[PDB]
Amino acid sequence: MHHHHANDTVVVGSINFTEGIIVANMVAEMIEAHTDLKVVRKLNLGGENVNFEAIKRGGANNGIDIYVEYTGHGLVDILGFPSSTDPEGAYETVKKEYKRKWNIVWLKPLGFNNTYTLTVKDELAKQYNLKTFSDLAKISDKLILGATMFFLEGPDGYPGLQKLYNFKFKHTKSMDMGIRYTAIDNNEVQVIDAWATDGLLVSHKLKILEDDKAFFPPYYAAPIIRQDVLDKHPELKDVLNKLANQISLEEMQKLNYKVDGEGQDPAKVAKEFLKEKGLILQVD
């Protein structure tokens, strides 16, 4: 699964994915509050690999200098390595390899693991004492999965997950857009797929289950930056590392909800979050 549908200038990128826009705007705000660097906020069109192609180009070549990447995307999709089960091993691997291959520096994780998950209504989890994918698999022969199309079409999706856990859902319905949220609300399906930080989980009274057999890789978000930009502006390392461990899963979910559920401006959501925990000053 993919996370998509001194007066010099630094270019911060994201693609059109709510979480990505929010965290990219946070990165921009931190640079604008703590340095005199000019920040271009580039919204790249296309899938998430456009960010990787852009960072290899660099802001000086109509690309970008910084974006927020997930450890497992770098590990599996970019480097082609197997899906590790250890967050630290995954992080150290991408950090070492990105530095060696492309002179790209992984900074510290933001604090959340936006991994792919299966979710059920809180009420179902309470009724059947569900915590893990393995718990769900045991009762899956009574249940229906409503899932995004890409999750059903791929060995890294439900087919592979089904093999590892022996899922036996009666039906697996392809439901794009917001169809599966309405379906689970209506008890037409009993399980949906979602990113762990999906802004709709709390408002739909949904519970994320644990991938106890570790099918999915770690997906810890962290800023990554070109070394040549750090060479010119070494102060960016400490400025951006002020975000280290500053965004929990629950905090990120709430920000995604403000945008996707409440229609708030992601730039305002990002800046207000930083101001409310003192990461920028009240007058910044």
Ligand code: NA
């Ligand atoms: Na690195």
Ligand code: NA
């Ligand atoms: Na993180």
Ligand code: NA
């Ligand atoms: Na099935």
Ligand code: NA
């Ligand atoms: Na806050």
